[PDB]
Amino acid sequence: QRPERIKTTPYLEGDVLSSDSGPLLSVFALQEIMQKVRQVQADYMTATREVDFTVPDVQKILDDIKALAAEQVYKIVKVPSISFRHIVMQSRDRVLRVDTYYEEMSQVGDVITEDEPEKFYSTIIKKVRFIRGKGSFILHDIPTRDHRGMEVAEPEVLGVEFKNVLPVLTAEHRAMIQNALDGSIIENGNVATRDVDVFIGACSEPVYRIYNRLQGYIEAVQLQELRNSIGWLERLGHRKRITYSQEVLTDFRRQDTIWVLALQLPVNPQVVWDVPRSSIANLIMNIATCLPTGEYIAPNPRISSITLTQRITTTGPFAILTGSTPTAQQLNDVRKIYLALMFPGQIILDLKIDPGERMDPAVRMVAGVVGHLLFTAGGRFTNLTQNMARQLDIALNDYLLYMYNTRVQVNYGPTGEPLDFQIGRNQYDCNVFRADFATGTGYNGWATIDVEYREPAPYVHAQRYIRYCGIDSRELINPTTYGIGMTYHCYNEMLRMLVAAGKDSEAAYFRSMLPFHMVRFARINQIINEDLHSVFSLPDDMFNALLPDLIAGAHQNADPVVLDVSWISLWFAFNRSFEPTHRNEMLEVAPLIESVYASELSVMKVDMRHLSLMQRRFPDVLIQARPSHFWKAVLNDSPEAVKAVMNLSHSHNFINIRDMMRWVMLPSLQPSLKLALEEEAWAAANDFEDLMLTDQVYMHRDMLPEPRLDDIERFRQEGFYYTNMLEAPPEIDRVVQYTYEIARLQANMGQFRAALRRIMDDDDWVRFGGVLRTVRVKFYDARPPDDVLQGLPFSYDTIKYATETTIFYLIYNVEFSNTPDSLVLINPTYTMTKVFINKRIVERVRVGQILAVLNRRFVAYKGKMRIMDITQSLKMGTKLAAPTV
Amino acid sequence: DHRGMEVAEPEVLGVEFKNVLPVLTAEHRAMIQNALDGSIIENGNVATRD
Numbered sequence: 042q043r044p045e046r047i048k049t050t051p052y053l054e055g056d057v058l059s060s061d062s063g064p065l066l067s068v069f070a071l072q073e074i075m076q077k078v079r080q081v082q083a084d085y086m087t088a089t090r091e092v093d094f095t096v097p098d099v100q101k102i103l104d105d106i107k108a109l110a111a112e113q114v115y116k117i118v119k120v121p122s123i124s125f126r127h128i129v130m131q132s133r134d135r136v137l138r139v140d141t142y143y144e145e146m147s148q149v150g151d152v153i154t155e156d157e158p159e160k161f162y163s164t165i166i167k168k169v170r171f172i173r174g175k176g177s178f179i180l181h182d183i184p185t186r187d188h189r190g191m192e193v194a195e196p197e198v199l200g201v202e203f204k205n206v207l208p209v210l211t212a213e214h215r216a217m218i219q220n221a222l223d224g225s226i227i228e229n230g231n232v233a234t235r236d237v238d239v240f241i242g243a244c245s246e247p248v249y250r251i252y253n254r255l256q257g258y259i260e261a262v263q264l265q266e267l268r269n270s271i272g273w274l275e276r277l278g279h280r281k282r283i284t285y286s287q288e289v290l291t292d293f294r295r296q297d298t299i300w301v302l303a304l305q306l307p308v309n310p311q312v313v314w315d316v317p318r319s320s321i322a323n324l325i326m327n328i329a330t331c332l333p334t335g336e337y338i339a340p341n342p343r344i345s346s347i348t349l350t351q352r353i354t355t356t357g358p359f360a361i362l363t364g365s366t367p368t369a370q371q372l373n374d375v376r377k378i379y380l381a382l383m384f385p386g387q388i389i390l391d392l393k394i395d396p397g398e399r400m401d402p403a404v405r406m407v408a409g410v411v412g413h414l415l416f417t418a419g420g421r422f423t424n425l426t427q428n429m430a431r432q433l434d435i436a437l438n439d440y441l442l443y444m445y446n447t448r449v450q451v452n453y454g455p456t457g458e459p460l461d462f463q464i465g466r467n468q469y470d471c472n473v474f475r476a477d478f479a480t481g482t483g484y485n486g487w488a489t490i491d492v493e494y495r496e497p498a499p500y501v502h503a504q505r506y507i508r509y510c511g512i513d514s515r516e517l518i519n520p521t522t523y524g525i526g527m528t529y530h531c532y533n534e535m536l537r538m539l540v541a542a543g544k545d546s547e548a549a550y551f552r553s554m555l556p557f558h559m560v561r562f563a564r565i566n567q568i569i570n571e572d573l574h575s576v577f578s579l580p581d582d583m584f585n586a587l588l589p590d591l592i593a594g595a596h597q598n599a600d601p602v603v604l605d606v607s608w609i610s611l612w613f614a615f616n617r618s619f620e621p622t623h624r625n626e627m628l629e630v631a632p633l634i635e636s637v638y639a640s641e642l643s644v645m646k647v648d649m650r651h652l653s654l655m656q657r658r659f660p661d662v663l664i665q666a667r668p669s670h671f672w673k674a675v676l677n678d679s680p681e682a683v684k685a686v687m688n689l690s691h692s693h694n695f696i697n698i699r700d701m702m703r704w705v706m707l708p709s710l711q712p713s714l715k716l717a718l719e720e721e722a723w724a725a726a727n728d729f730e731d732l733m734l735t736d737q738v739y740m741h742r743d744m745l746p747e748p749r750l751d752d753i754e755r756f757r758q759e760g761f762y763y764t765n766m767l768e769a770p771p772e773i774d775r776v777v778q779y780t781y782e783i784a785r786l787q788a789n790m791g792q793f794r795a796a797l798r799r800i801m802d803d804d805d806w807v808r809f810g811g812v813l814r815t816v817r818v819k820f821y822d823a824r825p826p827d828d829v830l831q832g833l834p835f836s837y838d839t840i841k842y843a844t845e846t847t848i849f850y851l852i853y854n855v856e857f858s859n860t861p862d863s864l865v866l867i868n869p870t871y872t873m874t875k876v877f878i879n880k881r882i883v884e885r886v887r888v889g890q891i892l893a894v895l896n897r898r899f900v901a902y903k904g905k906m907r908i909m910d911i912t913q914s915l916k917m918g919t920k921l922a923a924p925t926v
Numbered sequence: 927d928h929r930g931m932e933v934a935e936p937e938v939l940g941v942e943f944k945n946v947l948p949v950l951t952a953e954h955r956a957m958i959q960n961a962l963d964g965s966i967i968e969n970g971n972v973a974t975r976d
Contacts, residue, residue: 596974656930665927789956 045517045567046620053560055338058617061376063332063625064100067325069373070380071096071689073604074321092694097685099329105682107630110304110637110912114715115177115255117908119184122175124243125201125894128820130852133209134888135760137850142245143882144818146171147733152845153815158666162652162674168732169648170678173722176251179259179908180901183238185230188223192230196222200243203891214888221892238901243894247725254721256900258714262302264292270306270915272925274632277499278917281571281628289922299902301910303714304636310502310576311709312639317700318692320579320599324387325689327577330631332383333568335621344553358546362407367613374610378415379619382565385507386422386587386601387579391429393605400609406443408611409436410539410547413474413484414532414558415615417509420481421491422588426603430476434459434483437474441542449543465541473534478592485510487531503578507569512559514567527556561618568621572628576635629917636915639711641683644719648675650705651723661781661811662843668698668705730880734813737877738834738846739771740797741806744869745830745851750859760885763851767877776806781842784809788840809834815845816876818883822852830872848876850883932967939965 048054075094082089128137149171150164184195207215228239244252271290278285294300313323345357357363367375374393381388412433416424438459442451452468454461460471474483481487493506510529532555539548583599590597627634652671656663676684687693710716726732746763750756777800787793800807819829829847836844886893902908927933936943950958969976 660929664929666930667927786956789952791952 052341055340058337058339060336062334063328066332066380067099067329069376070328071325074602092691102682102685106634106637109680109682110633115179117179117181119182120198121200123200123202124245127203127206129205129209130760131757131854132760135885136206138884138886140882143733147817153813153843155662155843158663159670159674162671166674166678169722169726172247172725173718176248177255177718180899182904183901185227192227193223194225194227194240199895201894210888218891238903240899241895242897242899244897247731249897250721250725251718254717258717267302268925271921273307274917280499280574283918285918285920289920291922297905297907299906299908301908303912305712306632306636306915308576308635308639309709309711310500312642312711313576314580315704315707315709316687317696317704322689323577327573327575330627331573331575331625333572333621333625334623335619338618338620340557340616358550362612371610371613374606375614377604377606378610378614381424383569386584389423389601389603390425391603391605392432393607405436405608406440408608409433409440411611411615413437414535416484417486418476418484419478420486423478434475446543467541469538469541471538485531489530500574500576502580505581507566509562509566510559512563514563517563527559564620575631633915638683638686640713640715641680643711643716645675645679647719653705659813662813668701672701730878733816735816735878736810736813738809738814739806739875740873741875742801743872747864750855750861753855753857756855761853765875766848767875770877771806776808778808780811784842785840812843814843817845817847819847819849821849822854825849832874834874846874846876928963933963934965934967936962
């Protein structure tokens with residue numbers, strides 16, 4: 042139905058030679074890249090590290106990327122998790138309140154040691170991910186109850202567990218607790234048309250931050266963002282000329298539906314193109330996702346020869362070449378040539394040399410003429426290297442001077458360069474066909490505008506238009522000249538020089554074949570400008586800088602891929618045309634893939650940026666650290682598909698720490714819900730007391746208390762207990778500060794223990810600050826082992842400065858058969874280690890303050906509401922009823 | 927690695943002294959270790975290659 046493919050004359054009718062597509066060509070290009078390096082390292086002696094240059098499955102990688110967009114980072118629950126529990130002692134009016142968050146927090150990750158920085162980074166990452174996961178939830182359909190004409194919440198949704206306290210309480214205390222429980226109301230519960238449930242409950246602060254952030258994101262991201270994404274999709278579809286169905290999307294919303302949209306579709310290309318050594322991978326992904334499928338078409342046989350009578354027929358100048366058929370290797374070379382043509386600047390060609398090959402000399406001489414008309418060699422971009430241009434010039438020189446007919450006059454110049462002569466009776470100057478990459482003379486860019494700029498593109502980083510041979514794709518629908526008027530400068534000059542050199546049959550052949558050649562390049566221009574537009578396209582500035590960097594021989598961050606072809610492949614490629622038939626299967630779902638990839642990259646970069654400041658914040662923990670340590674720690678906890686995409690060309694084996702650090706400090710990011718939650722988790726984790734890590738570890742000599750059991754019941758009512766938790770840090774006038782270096786020097790000189798002993802006999806304190814330490818919490822109803830009461834903050838290997846410390850709470854239990862001085866011993870029992878945390882992990886409260894933790898506002902959806910995820914709806918081929926402007 | 931800078935291993939320095947270490951005193955061992963920690967590797971450049 043496309044008017045470009047309508048054919049009214051039999052000139053453009055040809056046989057189908059072969060067919061090719063995008064998923065085939067991506068794998069073919071990867072294999073051709075890897076085989077070259079393998080063979081080169083096989084032929085010559087090489088000193089390098091071992092790398093296995095394998096080729097992966099691109100289709101499975103793309104499928105995994107698609108599957109990655111269906112996973113959610115939130116969950117729906119009916120009640121929140123418990124945040125506070127209680128411990129009942131022998132007292133009837135005093136209990137212990139324990140904040141559980143720190144209790145599960147202290148058990149996440151590995152033990153911190155100075156000798157392994159990578160494990161330290163991994164532990165920090167696990168703790169942050171635990172914080173993020175613990176708080177991403179949505180409340181839905183909570184259980185309520187009616188009470189004296191109003192709605193109250195069930196005790197099981199309040200987030201605090203206290204049921205084990207009720208049997209021991211008195212009647213008055215039980216009545217008070219019951220009244221306090223009944224005071225927990227549902228906001229404006231007597232309204233029939235209500236939409237949410239609001240109440241007051243208990244939660245920890247880091248969890249509450251994530252809960253609030255998720256609630257706000259759900260509230261804010263709605264219809265308008267969806268409309269913006271669909272509008273950008275419409276603009277891209279208009280650029281790519283897709284077909285639309287008749288149904289349109291309406292802004293109607295049901296009053297019982299809640300949308301969740303986790304991705305914003307317009308992607309920043311800087312995020313994609315900032316990945317180090319990622320040009321080849323981006324090229325492969327562009328080929329795999331955007332290239333259409335089509336066939337190769339041979340020219341009409343009537344163009345070459347004419348029959349006048351049954352036995353009278355005109356003979357063609359290239360009969361032997363037009364009768365030949367390619368081999369498999371020559372077909373692969375033709376595919377390489379078309380790959381180079383469809384990606385200007387990014388892929389360039391060179392000459393393959395095979396001494397075992399035996400071919401007619403005329404093949405090279407014909408390819409010399411063909412290559413000048415087939416390729417662009419300067420001005421703005423290039424399809425080929427300077428060496429191949431030199432070889433083509435030499436081949437053209439040899440073709441022009443070989444006169445199998447009557448000779449013509451030749452006047453050589455003083456210089457010995459090829460094509461330095463005048464030819465024919467009109468003395469045509471052949472110096473203009475020698476390559477010069479600055480001006481582009483002698484090739485398709487000669488006196489032609491190759492790159493054009495027009496109205497702004499859907500992708501902001503790629504604005505250019507490619508106009509090979511100066512012909513527009515619109516010329517196939519609304520021509521400019523007649524049938525004989527189609528020409529351009531280089532082709533015309535080549536025809537004139539062929540005529541001047543006495544080669545008339547060849548000039549007639551090329552004059553006949555010119556419209557076919559120009560139509561082929563129009564098709565190529567259309568394919569480049571419409572089908573291949575994506576975020577994996579090369580940015581404009583890099584494209585502009587490709588050619589001067591090649592001429593000057595400078596370092597390139599986007600070094601072009603070089604492929605080698607044979608001589609006869611040029612002739613085979615000149616006599617074909619690629620005609621697309623079907624669009625790529627993945628065209629409509631590509632932007633979602635691009636968005637997922639960019640969002641995951643942004644999350645990884647944020648994690649690495651936050652880890653990069655650790656050594657400056659704690660130098661004594663990370664003495665033996667490198668940037669590669671947190672690099673590997675972050676990539677150990679990333680999705681496999683993203684790593685597979687980044688590692689297509691095995692760039693992970695060759696990047697250095699300078700590349701890592703320059704990537705970390707780049708500012709570009711891609712927003713998403715996962716990124717917002719991760720950043721909130723990092724903001725919570727900026728306080729290291731929330732990770733159960735500290736350096737406020739002290740030593741002081743204390744003895745376990747030995748109370749008098751004069752009255753058993755009165756002592757029981759006290760709720761006596763002992764702990765090494767400190768309420769306040771000790772006074773500065775009685776603390777001796779130690780560092781890691783001083784302590785280790787005094788340990789090597791064998792005089793550290795004497796210093797510690799001398800300090801301890803003076804009733805002073807010692808602080809082992811400077812290094813972070815892992816902290817555990819334990820509870821005991823009896824006398825603990827000597828491991829914990831005599832646990833020193835160091836150990837002897839030379840010493841180890843850090844060692845996990847245990848904060849213990851010891852509860853004293855006595856019976857009626859206890860003698861008033863039964864616990865008194867003849868000698869004291871000493872304890873040494875104390876910790877200051879500045880959090881209320883454990884607290885002794887009266888039974889009148891049990892429900893004082895209810896201070897968090899929760900908003901829950903009612904059972905009539907539905908929560909749906911609409912991220913899958915971001916596909917290219919849909920239309921809005923009211924378009925966005 | 928040592929405190930953000932890169933130092934070379936003793937087996938590339940071109941001098942062998944592993945048989946002397948067992949008979950040193952504590953102060954001599956500390957002095958030797960401190961001296962070893964000060965062999966810094968610089969980042970050079972030949973023909974635009976670091």
